[PDB]
DNA sequence: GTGATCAC
DNA sequence: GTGATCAC
């Protein structure tokens, strides 16, 4: 899914930013919770990075 | 190790 | 084909 709501992330370049993830999904093995993951673009570098989403962020 | 995703 | 993303 593409996300709508912004997320507080630490960028690879070291900054606090609020970014809307371009894709989001659940990353979990069988029997365990895992995490939710967002695909983000650092607007300072144009570089792509992944980052944990809050547990209640909608997929 | 396991899970999904995709820019590189 | 894989790095890198986390929590268990």
Swiss-Prot record:
Record PTM text: Methylated at multiple sites, to varying extents.
N6-methyllysine, modified sites: 15
Name of a matching Pfam family: Cren7
Cellular location(s): Chromosome; Cytoplasm
Keywords assigned: Chromosome, Cytoplasm, DNA-binding, Methylation
InterPro entries, sorted: Cren7_sf, dsDNA-bd_Cren7
One Gene Ontology term of the molecular function aspect: double-stranded DNA binding
Effect of residue 47 to E: Slightly reduces the melting temperature of the protein. Slightly reduces affinity for calf thymus DNA and poly(dA-dT) oligonucleotides. No significant effect on affinity for poly(dG-dC) oligonucleotide
Any single Gene Ontology cellular-component annotation: chromosome
Quaternary structure note: Monomer.
Biological role stated in the UniProt entry: A highly abundant chromatin protein, it binds double-stranded DNA without sequence specificity; there is approximately 1 Cren7 molecule for 10-12 bp of DNA. Constrains negative DNA supercoils. Induces DNA compaction and mediates intermolecular DNA bridging. Binding does not require protein methylation. Binds single-stranded DNA weakly. Increases DNA stability against thermal denaturation. Promotes formation of loose nucleoprotein structures with long DNA in the presence of albA proteins.
HAMAP family named among the record's database cross-references: Chromatin_Cren7
Membership in a protein family: Belongs to the Cren7 family.
UniProt-recorded name of the protein: Chromatin protein Cren7
Classification of source organism: Archaea, Thermoproteota, Thermoprotei, Sulfolobales, Sulfolobaceae
Gene name linked to the record: creN7
């Amino acid at each position: 899914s593409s996300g709508k709501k912004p997320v507080k992330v630490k960028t690879p370049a070291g900054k606090e930013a609020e970014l809307v993830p371009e894709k989001v999904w659940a990353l979990a093995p069988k029997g365990r919770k895992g995490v939710k993951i967002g695909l983000f673009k650092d607007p300072e570098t144009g570089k792509y990075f992944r980052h944990k989403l809050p547990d209640d962020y909608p997929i």
